[PDB]
Structure 1
Amino acid sequence: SQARVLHMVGDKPVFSFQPRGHLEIGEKLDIIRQSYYLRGAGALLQHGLVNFTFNKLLRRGFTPMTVPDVGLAGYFMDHTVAFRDLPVRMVCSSTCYRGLYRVHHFTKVEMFGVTGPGLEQSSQLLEEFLSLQMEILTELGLHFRVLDMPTQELGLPAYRKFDIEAWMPGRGRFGEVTSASNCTDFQSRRLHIMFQTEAGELQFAHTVNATACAVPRLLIALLESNQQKDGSVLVPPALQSYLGTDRITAPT
């Protein structure tokens, strides 16, 4: 019926002041401008988040893919996978079209999985994708909660669904930053995504989907969370390589 809190990770940050919204921080640091537009350290944050996640998923054995822009499944349309290749793990960084809360275009990295027969395989894969999401978020220093979304209440094209909300102090609330869902044979039935069994059967495979990074939301969470009383925001260690610093300090 309603969403259950499955897990809690990290702590709410403590402030001696009233936390500011990501827009105020960005403007004070000259990393957000204008429509909207990232500049300097903010742009490095965006590209570094994408790269950290993409590399993490590459090290775990996800095959990368790129597309000219729903689609992730569609590229497996009318395709059959051998039993020996199951599960198939795909990672794709791409530009998607739909405060920085809702911009028309943004970069997102997505996870896609095609697995062996049945709920056991598909659920194992969904739990694996959720774990990757929590690992990435933990390594970024964010405070977040994992919630079980209802599926048979409205919805339907999902047997299980997990959403992750990261804490946003400037907004003062939790906001969704990742999603992951087990679509089972829905997508495979409609797109003819088959797997061949050991005996020689072709059967409808299972598909699993997950967001590995929605940057606008993660940016908001990092800026509000890591902000300082000086309007500085601290850089998580995982991103200090791409930024070249542990603290953004605003120009002169």
Structure 2
Amino acid sequence: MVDLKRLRQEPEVFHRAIREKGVALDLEALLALDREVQELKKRLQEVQTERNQVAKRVPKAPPEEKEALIARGKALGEEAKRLEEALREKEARLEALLLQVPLPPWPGAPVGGEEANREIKRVGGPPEFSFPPLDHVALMEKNGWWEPRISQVSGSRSYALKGDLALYELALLRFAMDFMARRGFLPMTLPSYAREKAFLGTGHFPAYRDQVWAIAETDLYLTGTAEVVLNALHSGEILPYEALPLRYAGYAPAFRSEAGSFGKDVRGLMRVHQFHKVEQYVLTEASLEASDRAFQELLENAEEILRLLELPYRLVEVATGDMGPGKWRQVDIEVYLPSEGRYRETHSCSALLDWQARRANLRYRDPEGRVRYAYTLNNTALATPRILAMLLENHQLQDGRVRVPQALIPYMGKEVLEPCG
């Protein structure tokens, strides 16, 4: 949500945002609609208040003038319900539209879709294997580390891990939570469902509605990221300046409808409906430099986890067309997946300024007593099973076993994932 005041004052700024980000929104039609709502609230002021006057004149009016006043009162009331109900219809239309206005991207955002994305940096590289490398599904198949029968039970885009890899999954999630807690984020284990209001807050509703699974006969939705929950915790609360920046490391199961197919056909561990994710969430003050400092920390944290995971990665500046309506700036971190001879997203770091704060109503009292919308940022800390696709392929040994990175040997108990059966 954008400040309707700034929207009215400098709509060309939002017009470029709608153009470069590709939002289907007619800014001129929204702006128009707003004028009508303004107009109709004023006209409704007139009738409900002339009605106030007629009703005030009624109690001691002579019988002649008293019924004239009832007559006038009725017509005016008619008018008022007509206007009232027109306003409500128009305002709902305005709000829905307002919910589609995107934040302007940062000045250096590449303009265009995913193909405009720009590699910032690359640390580490494709492993040079002494032998012919298997892909992660073939490592799993060979060591008996996943349960293919899960598709008959739950459907496709499901996985069930077994043996050492079951254990490894859990070790990586705890690892990421421990690493976030030593970086000063407050670890939180959270639910994977939220009411609608929390999805609206983040911006997942309306634009990414397609992607969320509703829990039927409830008013709950399962969340695709712990971010829907972390962002809505302080809605309607005004935070002390001294609380800022809030740094939450939230773990929750994530659920995605994944209404959108894998061109690299369908499966393995890359795109499943249910996965586990530790999220990095920050609420900071409404300054660009506070945002920039948080974005760089969010980024370095994710890089740091990849270095401890010993994975080759690169950072990518996400183009306007691809960052989504509420993003100021987005950088993805992609890790190399040998079997596809390409980098794959494992983390997206977004800075959304106050676009989510004005929707989720997140506010703080600045050093001068002024209440302000906060700025929010988020980045993945670690999501499984997807990084398992990359750990298996980058760390596979000759025999098909997989070495665990040094930092994860305390969490596993061992240096090598053994086969199951």
TM interval, short-chain normalised: over 0.9
Change (3 A) 1:153 1:172: closer
Q: Give the structure 2 partner of residue 124 of structure 1.
A: 293
Q: Give the structure 1 partner of residue 171 of structure 2.
A: 48
Q: TM-score, normalised by structure 2?
A: 0.58
Structure exhibiting the larger radius of gyration computed from Cα positions: 2
Check the 8 A contact 1:175/1:217 in 2, yes or no: no
Q: TM-score, normalised by structure 1?
A: 0.95
Q: Does 1:173 align with 2:287?
A: no
Q: Matched residues in 2 for 1:82 and 1:147: separation? A: 35
Structure with the higher fraction of residues in helix conformation: 2
Structure 2: state its 5+ residue gaps. Answer: 1-110, 152-158, 193-227, 257-267
Check the 8 A contact 2:125/2:336 in 1, yes or no: no
Structure 1 window deviating more from structure 2 (14-23 vs 206-215): it is: 14-23
Check the 8 A contact 1:3/1:148 in 2, yes or no: yes
Deviation (angstroms), 1:251: 4.3
Alignment partner for residue 81 of structure 1, among 239, 243, 259? 239
Q: Matched residues in 2 for 1:175 and 1:202: separation? A: 41
Structure 1 window deviating more from structure 2 (237-246 vs 142-151): it is: 237-246
Task: Tell me the amino acid that sits aligned with residue 30 of structure 1.
Answer: G
Counting aligned pairs with the same residue, the percent is: 37
Q: Matched residues in 2 for 1:135 and 1:93: separation? A: 18
Q: Give the structure 1 partner of residue 407 of structure 2.
A: 238
Q: Does 1:216 align with 2:385?
A: yes
Q: Give the structure 2 partner of residue 158 of structure 1.
A: 327
Structure with the higher fraction of residues in strand conformation: 1
Deviation (angstroms), 1:156: 2.8
Structure 1 window deviating more from structure 2 (60-69 vs 195-204): it is: 60-69
Task: Tell me the amino acid that sits aligned with residue 28 of structure 1.
Answer: K
Check the 8 A contact 2:250/2:279 in 1, yes or no: yes
Check the 8 A contact 1:31/1:41 in 2, yes or no: yes
Q: Give the structure 1 partner of residue 118 of structure 2.
A: 4
Aligned-residue CA RMSD in angstroms?
A: 1.5
Q: Matched residues in 1 for 2:346 and 2:362: separation? A: 28
Alignment partner for residue 94 of structure 1, among 236, 252, 265? 252
Change (3 A) 1:22 1:194: same
Deviation (angstroms), 1:63: 1.3
How many residue pairs get aligned? The number is 252
Q: Give the structure 1 partner of residue 183 of structure 2.
A: 60
Q: Deviations over 1:129-186 (max 9, x none)?
A: 0001101101111000011112366723111111000011122211111111001110
Check the 8 A contact 1:44/1:242 in 2, yes or no: no
